[PDB]
Amino acid sequence: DTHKSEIAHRFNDLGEENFQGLVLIAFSQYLQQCPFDEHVKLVKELTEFAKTCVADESHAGCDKSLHTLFGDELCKVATLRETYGDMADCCEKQEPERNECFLNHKDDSPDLPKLKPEPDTLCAEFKADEKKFWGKYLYEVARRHPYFYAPELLYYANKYNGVFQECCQAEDKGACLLPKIDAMREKVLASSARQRLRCASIQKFGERALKAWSVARLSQKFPKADFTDVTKIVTDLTKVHKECCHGDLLECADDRADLAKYICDHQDALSSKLKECCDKPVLEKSHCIAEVDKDAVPENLPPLTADFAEDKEVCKNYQEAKDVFLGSFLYEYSRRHPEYAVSVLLRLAKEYEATLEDCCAKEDPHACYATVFDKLKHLVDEPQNLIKKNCELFEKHGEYGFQNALIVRYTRKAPQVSTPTLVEISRSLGKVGTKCCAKPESERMPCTEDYLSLILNRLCVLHEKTPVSEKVTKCCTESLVNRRPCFSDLTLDETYVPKPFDEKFFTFHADICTLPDTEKQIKKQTALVELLKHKPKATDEQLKTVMENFVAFVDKCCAADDKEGCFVLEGPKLVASTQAALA
Ligand SMILES: C[C@H](CO)OC[C@@H](C)OC[C@H](C)OC[C@@H](C)O
Ligand SMILES: C[C@H](CO)OC[C@@H](C)OC[C@H](C)OC[C@@H](C)O
Ligand SMILES: C[C@H](CO)OC[C@@H](C)OC[C@H](C)OC[C@@H](C)O
Fold first, then answer.
1. How far apart are the CA of 24 and the centre of ligand 2, in A?
2. Is the CB of 481 under 6 A from ligand 3?
3. Angle at the Cα of 150 (from 144 to 156), degrees rounded to 5?
4. Which positions does UniProt annotate for Cu cation binding?
5. Is the peptide bond prior to 383 cis by the omega test (within 30 degrees of 0)?
6. For 450, how many CA atoms within 13 A lie in the half-sphere containing its CB?
7. How far is the CA of 258 from the centre of ligand 1 (A)?
8. Buried b (16+ CB within 10 A) or exposed e, 456-475
9. Which residue has the CA at smallest separation from atom 2 of ligand 3?
10. Which helix (H) or strand (E) holds 195?
11. What CATH code is assigned to 108-196?
12. Cβ of 223 less than 6 Å from ligand 3
């Protein structure tokens, strides 16, 4: 009834600016290939209707579900079948099947042109119309990242406004803007891959998967909070995420504000670090809570062995409520160990489960489970050795070299995967050395495992849409928690049948010389994957040889008088020599 006017409710809660930015973000994530101009028209239609409903909630159609009015507007796009083909058959369904149908067509890899920041243009547009400028930013990020966490995206537009405000008054605009745009881009991609994982985890493993993970993570952040408080916040947070992942962006933002306000209302029970956040306006306040540091572990917490090893009544407590007991173990263990990664803590709780499953059936269980922490130690040693061996590799070779060593590893593990994905994934895995290796001791394992989760999740998303490795299938779907170690344990796929040498990847036109350093690296790393797809067992000496000849060749032609001529006429020599080197 009254609150059947969901659209009026949302508009009242969020205010017009946020309402519109959220509706814009929604259209952009569902119809990633429509122009801004079109999306602005749809947002204005729905805002105008919301305003009619606010004035009068009994107006016709004002009682429809917000998500229904929104799906109806999507279906009312004339080019819908021309552009999105099958997507239009979504329209023939009732909700919530219609939406689940639309969501299915969200495109994780839409391959839209690269935005190349032209600072003077950016600044002319920003000066012309600040509000259109920000809209075009939301649209452009949102269409590229159809699962971006919508309220954070509103936040980024507000935050970076100060950028343009200061930078666009300067004469040397590009010196001011370009470093900041780079940093903006960094946060955005980080944020995107994080939200992508939250959505994949809900969709492929269930809401409970994301809850477990959140319980670990918040217990580290708010180690003084009570289990029941963590539980309340995680559930409310998981609803917010499920809503954003399902395209319910207004309800998602509305629920998040409520959560931010609840966390500020109760900060004394939660963390003293929250004081910084709580006098801020709503988007910054939520951002600031999402980013707050771990509070200090309180004094006087009993040793974990008191409740979970020494205690003679573990088996009783576990059999009486298996799930609460493990949840509680997870909370207790997480609060005391901010230095452990979330997934390591989840792996610890699973192994603990396994142990009690075995131990409680036994004659005398207490003797069996009392040494459980000795059993668990390997789950902490292995991530540690991973980090140790990889960080020395990274520092021995630097980022690009480290990327190249993972190119070799990953092509072997998953040779069926497409070369652009193996290059993209391997370059990100190597950047995990750049982001994590130099961090403090108590940050290295959380940082390493968290970025590995984000990048393997990106591999799983791409792969699940066009499956070509049974092994990558296995590691993606068998267990969210064991993804990283499942991937880590892969050896050369002995099932794989080598492809013939693909020469095009070792032959070039003159415009290779003109490429940015990154694109040049990508060309080389692409060649590298191709070497291995052809000869997965090539020796390091062969690979270095080929790649040294490759760089040598490009140098030589790029320095020629006739570049094209040297590439085309000499190019067959690199091909010939490369093959001779693989004999
Ligand atoms: C579609 C329409 C532009 O005409 O809305 C986009 C606009 C309201 O952006 C909202 C976003 C939160 O703005 C950024 C801040 C700094 O104004
Ligand atoms: C209001 C604001 C929403 O993003 O609060 C978030 C805060 C409670 O924690 C975010 C934290 C990093 O958990 C994310 C996990 C669930 O992947
Ligand atoms: C909210 C809930 C307990 O009430 O916490 C999640 C609980 C099932 O964690 C147990 C354990 C970590 O599960 C291992 C799986 C989810 O990876």
1. 23
2. yes
3. 85
4. 3
5. no
6. 20
7. 22
8. bbbbbbbbeeeeebebbeeb
9. 327
10. helix 173-205
11. 1.10.246.10
12. no
Fold (topology level) of 382-493 = Serum Albumin; Chain A, Domain 1 (1.10.246)
Instruction: Tell me the CATH class for 494-571.
Output: mainly alpha
State the structure-solving technique: X-ray
Ligand nearest to the CA of 293: 2
Report the separation in Å between the CA atom of 132 and the middle of ligand 1, taken as the mean of its atom positions: 7
Rg (CA), the chain: 27
Terminal Cα distance for the chain, rounded: 77
φ, ψ (nearest 5 deg) of residue 460? -65, -40
CATH number, domain 296-381, options 3.30.470.20, 1.25.40.390, 1.10.760.10, 1.10.246.10: 1.10.246.10
Is the C-beta atom of 323 inside 6 A of ligand 1? no
Q: Quick one: three-class SS letters along 276-310?
A: HHHCCCHHHHHHHHHHCCCCCCCCCCCCHHHHHHH
Q: Which two tokens stand for residue 467?
A: 């499956």
Tally of CA atoms within 13 A in the half-sphere of 45 that contains its CB:
14
Contacts of 197 (CB under 8 A, 6+ apart): 453, 454, 457
DSSP 215: H
520 near 541, Cβ under 8 Å?
no
| Distance from the Cα of residue 490 to its chain's centroid | 23
- Residue 141, C-beta contacts closer than 8 angstroms, at least 6 positions apart: 148, 153, 156, 188
477, two tokens: 């779907």
Q: Which residue's alpha carbon is at the smallest distance from atom 15 of ligand 2?
A: 214
Q: Is the CB of 231 under 6 A from ligand 3?
A: yes
Task: Residue 258: name the closest of 247, 243, 246, 268 by CA.
Answer: 243
* 285 within ligand 2 shell (Cβ under 6 A): no
Task: Please provide residue 444's backbone torsions phi and psi, each rounded to the nearest 5 degrees.
Answer: -65, -45
Task: Point out residues after which the chain has a gap (C–N over 2.5 Å).
Answer: none
Ligand nearest to the backbone CA of 214: 2
Contact 148/25 with Cβ under 8 angstroms?
yes
Q: Could you list the beta-strand ranges (E) of 105-233.
A: none
CATH classification code of 1-107: 1.10.246.10
